[PDB]
Write a protein that binds this ligand. Structure first.
Ligand SMILES: O=C(NO)[C@@H](O)[C@H](O)[C@@H](O)C(=O)[O-]
Ligand SMILES: O=C(NO)[C@@H](O)[C@H](O)[C@@H](O)C(=O)[O-]
Ligand SMILES: [Cl-]
Ligand SMILES: [Cl-]
Ligand SMILES: [Cl-]
Ligand SMILES: [Cl-]
Ligand SMILES: [Cl-]
Ligand SMILES: [Cl-]
Ligand SMILES: [Cl-]
Ligand SMILES: [Cl-]
Ligand SMILES: [Cl-]
Ligand SMILES: [Cl-]
Ligand SMILES: [Mg+2]
Ligand SMILES: [Mg+2]
Ligand SMILES: [Mg+2]
Ligand SMILES: [Mg+2]
Ligand SMILES: [Mg+2]
Ligand SMILES: [Mg+2]
Lengths: 381, 381
C-alpha cells in the first residue's frame, strides 16, 4: 500500500533506569525520560510503529532522509527502501545512522504485520514460538546491596535461577565506576556467580569493552577455570585483529561483534578472519530486522550461532524466526528493579517468561507491542 | 591551560555549492547555507576554532559529550581528551560521531598553535612547506557544458592542466543523476580526459561507491588501458573482502578505505588483509588530526602511501607534516565555479596554489584559517 505519512511522537515515560556518561544503564531515582514513537501510515489508514530515542528520529533526520525515501512508496518493498536509506548514509554527514535505519525498518515490518493480522516472526517464517532467555545483568555499580561487590552478583544470580533463567550473563564494572575496570574484580564476580548457581546453569560475561589484549587474555583464562560458556566484547571491536588473536589464544568461545559498524557486511569479515567463535547481531546494531535476518543467515551458512543483542519485540521476533541462536537476551536486570513490571506505555509485556525460563512470543500482529496510545497522548512533549 | 568554555556559533555563508539527496556536491543557484564554528577557550582567553556542519556540533552533542570531556581540562592533553570522547561513542546512541570528534580535535590543535604562535604542521613536526595538489573534480551532473558528458570532463581537464595541476581526479556520475551509474560512461569520461591531457599528467578516478564486484572489475580493467594511477572507492567499503578480491584482480592500484568507520584501527585491517594498495585517511573520516596522523604513521611503517581525503587547513596540515602522501586534495572543482575565490567567512585562502601546482601552507598560527570574525558576527543564525 502507498505510504502517505511518517510521524514521530515524543512522550515522557516514567522509569528508574538511568544511563551514565558512558552510556551504561543503572537503577536510580524514578524520573521522566523522553521516548519517541515512529509511525508509518498508508493510504488506507493502516499504521506501523516502533520506539527509539528522540534524537534518532529528530526532524532533521525525518525530513532530510526518511520521508524522502518512504513517502509515496509501496510499504512492502522493505528491501528496496532499506537499500535506499543505506546508500544515503555515506553522504549524510554522519547523521543517518544505523539506529535510524533500524527504527524505520521495524516500523515497516510492524505495518506489514498489523495490516495482515500476522505476527512478524510468522510472516518471516516461524521457527519457534518460545525461546530460552538468559538473564542479562546490568553493568556493575557502587550501590550497596546492588551490584557493588562480587558477592552481590552471586546473590542476584541465585534470584535469577529461582525465577527460572537457565542462563545468566554478567555485565561487570566499567567507568565511570570510580575504581573500574579491574580484571581480578571481574573474575571474582564470575566466581561468586558460579559458586552460587552450580555447574548446570550456563554463564556468560560481557566485560569492560576496551581492555588491552593482555588484560582480556587474563580475563579469558580466568573464565575457563569457571566453565563459562562465552566471553563477550572485552576489547575494542574496531580491532578485528585483536579478536582474531584473542580467539586463537582462548579456549572459551568469543562472541562478537556486537557494536562494530558495517552491518552484515562487516560481520562476514569476522567469520572470514576467524575473529570470533560465535557471531553477534542485533536489530539496533545492524540497522533493522531485515539486516539482522541476513546476519543470522550468514552465520547459519557457516554452521555458526549468531546471538541476538537486545531485548524488546524487534529482537524477539528475529530470534523466533531463526534456529541458530541459543537465547533471547532478557534485561537488563538489577535486584533493585522489577523487569516483569513492564513499561508505562505498553499495556502488557512483549516478552513474558514462564517459570521454566522460556519467553513466549505474543500472538499479537506486527511486532506485537501492546501500545498504550492513550498514555502516549496524555504524556506528549 | 585550563579549558573554560566550549562555544558554537552558527552563521550563514553564501555559496553556489549544493548537495543532492545522496550527499554529492553540485553547482547550483547562489544561496545561503548554515555553517557552524566551534570555539574552545582557555582561562587566559586564548581560543581555537574549527568549522563543521551545524548538526555535528548541535547542543545535544555539545552538552551531553563535548563539554563534559573538555571543560576544566588542560587543552594540551589532546590524546587523553580524544580517547575520552572515543570511549563514549559506543554508548552515545549513535549521536557522538567521528565527525564530532574531528571538529573538537581540530579546534584543540588550532588552540595550541594559536597559543604558541605556531602553525599546526610545525608543532607536529614539519616535513614539507609546499605540496603538489590534484584537481579533485565534482561528481558528474546533467548540466549542459558542466559535467554532463565525457567530453565535458575532457574540456575541464584541459583547464585544470593550464591552471598548473599535475594530477587530476575524476568523480564520475552517481544517483540521483537520472541515468547513473554506468561503467561504460565512466570509462568514456576517463578516456576523454587522458586524450585531452596526454600521458604525463597523473589521473585518478573515484567512482560510484556501490558498484558490484563485476562492475568494479570491468571499470578497473578499462582504467588500466588508460594508464590511470588509482581507482578509488568503486564498491561498498563495508565489504573488506570485496576490496581484497578487487585488488588481487586489478593491476591498477586500489586506494582505500575512505569512508569506512573504525578510524586507524580498521585501516590497519585493510593493510593486514591486503584490501588496498594505497591506504586512505582523512581528518573527517577518522575523527581528527590526531588519528589521521596515526593512520599516516601506520601506513608508513608498511612502506605504504596514505592519501589524505579532503581539502581545507586541517587536512593540508596533516599532509605537510607527513612524507608518505603524494597529494593534497584540492576541490571539489567544477567549470562553473571559481575555487580560488575562497569563502566569504575567510579573509584569504587556506590552500593557495602556485602556477606549478604546489599548494603553499600559510605561515599563520594554528590551522591558519584567516577567519573573518566580523562577517560571522554579522551573519549569525
Ligand atoms: O552489551 C549489551 N548487551 O549484551 C548492552 O547490554 C550494553 O551496551 C552494555 O554492554 C553496556 O552498557 O556496556
Ligand atoms: O570521495 C571524496 N573525495 O575524494 C568526497 O569527494 C566525496 O564524498 C565524493 O566521493 C562523493 O560525493 O561521492
Ligand atoms: Cl498492499
Ligand atoms: Cl502499493
Ligand atoms: Cl529455545
Ligand atoms: Cl513475565
Ligand atoms: Cl490505547
Ligand atoms: Cl599551557
Ligand atoms: Cl593546564
Ligand atoms: Cl540539539
Ligand atoms: Cl610534494
Ligand atoms: Cl590560489
Ligand atoms: Mg553485549
Ligand atoms: Mg579459541
Ligand atoms: Mg529485587
Ligand atoms: Mg574519495
Ligand atoms: Mg592489484
Ligand atoms: Mg570556469
Amino acid at each position: 500500500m502507498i505510504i502517505t505519512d511518517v510521524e514521530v511522537r515524543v512522550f515522557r515515560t516514567t522509569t528508574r533506569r538511568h544511563s551514565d556518561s558512558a552510556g551504561h544503564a543503572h537503577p536510580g531515582p524514578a524520573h521522566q525520560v523522553e521516548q519517541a514513537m515512529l509511525t508509518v501510515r498508508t493510504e488506507d489508514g493502516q499504521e506501523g510503529h516502533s520506539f527509539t530515542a528522540p534524537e534518532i528520529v529528530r526532524p532533521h533526520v525525518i525530513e532530510k532522509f526518511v520521508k524522502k525515501v518512504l513517502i509515496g512508496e509501496d510499504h512492502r518493498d522493505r528491501e528496496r527502501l532499506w537499500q535506499d536509506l543505506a546508500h544515503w548514509q555515506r553522504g549524510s554527514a554522519a547523521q543517518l545512522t544505523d539506529r535510524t535505519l533500524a527504527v524505520v525498518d521495524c516500523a515497516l515490518w510492524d505495518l506489514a504485520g498489523r495490516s495482515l493480522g500476522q505476527p512478524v516472526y510468522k510472516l518471516i517464517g516461524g521457527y519457534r514460538d518460545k525461546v530460552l532467555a538468559y538473564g542479562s545483568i546490568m553493568c556493575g555499580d557502587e550501590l550497596e546491596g546492588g551490584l557493588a561487590t562480587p558477592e552481590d552478583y552471586g546473590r542476584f544470580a541465585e534470584t535469577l535461577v529461582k525465577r527460572g533463567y537457565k542462563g545468566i550473563k554478567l555485565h561487570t564494572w566499567m567507568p565511570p565506576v570510580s575504581w573500574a575496570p579491574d580484571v581480578k574484580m571481574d573474575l571474582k564476580a564470575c566466581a561468586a556467580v558460579r559458586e552460587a548457581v552450580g555447574p548446570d546453569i550456563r554463564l556468560m560475561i560481557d566485560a569492560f569493552h576496551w581492555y588491552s589484549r593482555t588484560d582480556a587474555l587474563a580475563l579469558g583464562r580466568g573464565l575457563e577455570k569457571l566453565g563459562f560458556d562465552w566471553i563477550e566484547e572485552p576489547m575494542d571491536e574496531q580491532s578485528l585483529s585483536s579478536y582474531k588473536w584473542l580467539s586463537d589464544n582462548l579456549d572459551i568461545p568469543v562472541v562478537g561483534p556486537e557494536s562494530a559498524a558495517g552491518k552484515h557486511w562487516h560481520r562476514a569479515e569476522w567469520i572470514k578472519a576467524g575473529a570470533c567463535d560465535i557471531l553477534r547481531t542485533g536489530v539496533n546494531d545492524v540497522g533493522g530486522i531485515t539486516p539482522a535476518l541476513k546476519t543470522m543467515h550468514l552465520a547459519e551458512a557457516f554452521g555458526m550461532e549468531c546471538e541476538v543483542h537486545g531485548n524488546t519485540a524487534m529482537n524477539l521476533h528475529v530470534v523466533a524466526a531463526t534456529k541458530n541462536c541459543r537465547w533471547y537476551e532478557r534485561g537488563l536486570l538489577h535486584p533493585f528493579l522489577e523487569y516483569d513490571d513492564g513499561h508505562d506505555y505498553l499495556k502488557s509485556l512483549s516478552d513474558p517468561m514462564d517459570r521454566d525460563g522460556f519467553v513466549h512470543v505474543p500472538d499479537r500482529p506486527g511486532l506485537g507491542e501492546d501500545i498504550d496510545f492513550t498514555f502516549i497522548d496524555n504524556n506528549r512533549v
